[PDB]
């Protein structure tokens, strides 16, 4: 709190966790702040919105392997700083965009910056926290920042859009990014290239590990249900009138609150009971919630399932982010740069391929018979997390 308390104190390695939390929070606050502003910018009205979820996720998924390999030869601080340096430019571009193509360009640039920050921040919380329990706790806390950003984005953006203009939601978001950059400069040293001592396992050897494929598949499938629902919602299709401000402001509160609660509890509760158990019970809850979704008569019927699934998703993440570092320690070389590129690609594949493949399938058969398939897929994948109870060693 006090300005002097930071000057006379040992830096306690919790500043790195604070930086990661802040970077994730700002990346996810910029991601969702455009939700109240999309209907002002409008193929079908749900195809244009589908291209806004996919444009950023595709580029982030493409970029992640490169950052995973790059942190090995440069170290983490330079990519972490580049994340902020691209977030600021993305915000400035958003505030001065007057069409749809500029929206897409800003989304892609933000995707590049977000990939840098996420891969180089998750993979550094593991290099400094080599204790299993401490690593679990810190990654749960850091993943809470994602939920906090998603919670805070849309309402703050909507308030500033309705009250004090259209460029305001981004001209008060560039200042926070600047403050985050100042804090990063205070803690890190983004001016020195620090190659890692040892060369890690190749990306084509980690991908052959069954115990890494299972942990990545859990994260990939857990997000495949909510990724195909949000682009196809009634709220997008209507203008910003006739009480549509309220629907765009509070649309993503339930999932965000549930994710926050679940991840915060299970970051510390994933070791008292096995992480395999959190993932196993976090993939049946997703299945049941997705199965219950297509029984909703009106929009309110999506309030209660979108709670449960969100909570479940949190558990899975908060259980399977530390397990990647644990498995790479137990069976491979302790270099976490390229094992969290796998996690990020798995996380973002759902949003990369959702608004297109889900749309084509829903046109082929129907939405209820798509949600049913996704739910059954999740439930069927759930038992495979039993193979993470005691994996072998080197």
């Amino acid at each position: 709190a006090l300005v002097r308390w930071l000057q006379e104190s040992r830096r306690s390695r919790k500043l790195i966790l604070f930086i990661v939390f802040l970077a994730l929070l700002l990346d996810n606050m910029l991601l969702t702040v455009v939700v109240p502003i999309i209907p002002s910018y409008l193929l079908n009205e749900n195809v244009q919105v589908g291209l806004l979820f996919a444009s950023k996720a595709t580029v982030q998924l493409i970029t992640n392997p490169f950052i995973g390999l790059l942190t090995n030869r440069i170290g983490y601080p330079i990519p972490i700083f580049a994340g902020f340096c691209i977030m600021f430019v993305s915000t400035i571009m958003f505030a001065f965009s007057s069409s749809y193509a500029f929206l897409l360009i800003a989304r892609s640039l933000q995707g590049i910056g977000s990939s840098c920050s996420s891969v180089a921040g998750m993979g550094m919380l593991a290099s400094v926290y080599t204790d299993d329990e401490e690593r679990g706790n810190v990654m749960g806390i850091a993943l809470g920042g994602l939920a906090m950003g998603v919670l805070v984005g849309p309402p703050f953006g909507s308030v500033l859009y309705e009250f004090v203009g259209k460029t305001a939601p981004f001209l008060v978001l560039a200042a926070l990014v600047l403050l985050d950059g100042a804090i990063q400069l205070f803690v890190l040293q983004p001016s020195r290239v620090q190659p890692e001592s040892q060369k890690g396992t190749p990306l084509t050897t980690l991908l052959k590990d069954p115990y890494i494929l299972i942990a990545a598949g859990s994260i990939c499938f857990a997000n495949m249900g909510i990724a195909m629902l949000e682009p196809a919602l009634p709220i997008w299709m209507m203008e910003t009138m006739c009480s549509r401000k309220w629907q765009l402001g509070v649309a993503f509160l339930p999932a965000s609150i549930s994710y926050l609660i679940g991840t915060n509890i299970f970051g510390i509760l994933a070791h008292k009971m096995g992480r395999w158990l959190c993932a196993l019970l976090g993939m049946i809850i997703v299945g049941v919630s997705i199965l219950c979704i297509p029984f909703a008569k009106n929009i309110y019927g999506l309030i209660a399932p979108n709670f449960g699934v969100g909570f479940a998703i949190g558990m899975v993440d908060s259980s399977m982010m530390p397990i990647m570092g644990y498995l790479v320690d137990l069976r491979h070389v302790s270099v976490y740069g390229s094992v969290y590129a796998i996690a990020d690609v798995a996380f973002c594949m759902g949003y990369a391929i959702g608004p297109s493949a889900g749309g084509a399938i829903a046109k082929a058969i129907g939405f209820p018979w798509l949600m049913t398939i996704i739910g059954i897929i999740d439930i069927l994948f759930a038992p495979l997390c039993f193979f993470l109870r005691s994996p072998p060693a080197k």
Partner: antibody
Amino acid sequence: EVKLQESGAELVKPGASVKLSCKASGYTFTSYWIDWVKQRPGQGLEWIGNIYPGNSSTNYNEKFKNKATLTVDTSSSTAYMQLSSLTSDDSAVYYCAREDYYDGTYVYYAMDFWGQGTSVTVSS
Amino acid sequence: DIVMTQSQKFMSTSVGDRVSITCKASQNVGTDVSWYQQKPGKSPKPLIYWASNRFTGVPDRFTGSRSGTDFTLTISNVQSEDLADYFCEQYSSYPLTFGAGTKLELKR
């Protein structure tokens, strides 16, 4: 190479003050914290305080607030610690150490270089 | 003021034997403990930082572990060079506390 040269031994009277010195060389002096530790013969080590030579911002053990005052000399790159009203129980061995940051960050992880002790003795 | 207790101040082991030195904190210090070794007639040198990691030049024998508030330094092949004083550290709270110290001695 990093080096913290220190005095061999100091002899003081039962009422007096002594200014231990620790001369730092081999690196940029004004960017690393310098700690002082005290080891009585046959007992554990006790922290005394920190100083940051760039800002001259110091920290003290509550037990040693009224005894040891740390100060710095940037021009000659030296670190001083003054002990006041020396008596017995104040005849330990005093160490000057340098704090290091984790590579690429400013997070402290270990104290790399410790100077050789200064065997302060109190006797009339 | 967190008190780091080192129970045994003198440990006796023959060459080529496993030894383990234990330290116990009072409050909760989360892997904020470093293990230092001081050879006879020399200034201390770091061995373990953050309670698990090993310094750059420390041999492979030394391993650091934590089991809650109990920290342990294990030497696998005790050699004639590993006869020194070993002490803990803590910096979670600011008044720094070191362990009393454990001295290794030969057996005959």
